[model samples]
Structures are given as structure tokens and as C-alpha cells.
Target: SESLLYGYFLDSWLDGTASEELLRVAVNAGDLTQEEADKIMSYPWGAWND
Candidate 1:
């Protein structure tokens, strides 16, 4: 579930749709715990933007 959610997160980021909504979807779907979602949401995504 984590892997799939991460993939979806990445794809959404690439699609320019990455937002709190994405994380909410994952959480609501049980794809990620609050802890995991917090870490992911806090991750340094700008590092990968290049």
C-alpha cells in the first residue's frame, strides 16, 4: 500500500496535481498512516523538481 501510494504521489506530482488532497485521498483509503503521510508531506520535494 505504501509503495502504491508513493507511486501515486509521484505521478500526481509529475502531473502537477500534488496537493493536500492527494495525501487526504491516501489517508482516507488507508494507504498511509498519519505518521507516514506527515513525513511524506514534509519531504523536500524541491530537491526532485530539477
Candidate 2:
């Protein structure tokens, strides 16, 4: 269930709705860790197109 929820949140992020605040909450819920969340937030967006 949490994995599905995480996927939904991740998709929302890709769609430009989910925010870092939302990801923080996900960490608080134990669906992810601060490290994992940070990694996601820190990913190179510019590289995605490259």
C-alpha cells in the first residue's frame, strides 16, 4: 500500500503537483527515508532531458 502511495506521490511530483513538503511527510510516514527523499530532490533535472 505504501509503495503504491509512494508511486502516486512520485507521479504527482513528475506532473508538478507534489512538493518537497509532501516528500517530507512521506519520510515521516516511513514510506521513505530522508536520504532517499533528498536523493530524489537532488536528482539532476536538466540531465533528465539529456
Candidate 3:
């Protein structure tokens, strides 16, 4: 769930202007919890995770 929501935020953040309020709202509305959000946010989407 956290990964999913973070992906949403990451998409928005990368595609959009990524305002703090927008990020907050996106994170809050996301399916993940705060802890999960934090965890997911720590990762970089461009990395080789395989």
C-alpha cells in the first residue's frame, strides 16, 4: 500500500510542481500510512531495484 501510494505521490511530485501542500495532501490522501509514506519516500524511482 505504501509503495502504491508513494508511487502516486512520486508520479505527481515528478510530473507536477510538487508543492509542499500538494505533497502533504497527496501523502495524506494516499493509501499508505505516515510511516509507510516515509519509508517509500526514501527510495529513488530511477534506481535498479531488481
TM-score leader? 2
Model 2 per-residue lDDT tens digits across residues 1-50: 24546556556566666678988999899887777677667644334234
What TM-score does candidate 1 get on C-alpha atoms? 0.56
2-40: candidate 3 lDDT, tens digit per residue: 455566666644554344565556557765466754554
Clashing pairs in 1: none
lDDT of candidate 1 over 10-39, digit per residue (tens):
556555567777777887888767766677
lDDT for each candidate structure = 0.66, 0.66, 0.54
Model 2 RMSD to the real structure? 4.1
Judged by lDDT relative to the true structure, which candidate is superior, 1 or 3?
A: 1
- Comparing candidate 1 with candidate 3, which one achieves the higher TM-score? 1
Off by more than 4 A, model 2: 1-8, 44-50
Clashing pairs in 2: none
- Between prediction 1 and prediction 2, the one with superior TM-score is 2
In model 3, the clashing pairs are none
Q: Is candidate 2 or candidate 3 better by TM-score?
A: 2
lDDT of 2: 0.66
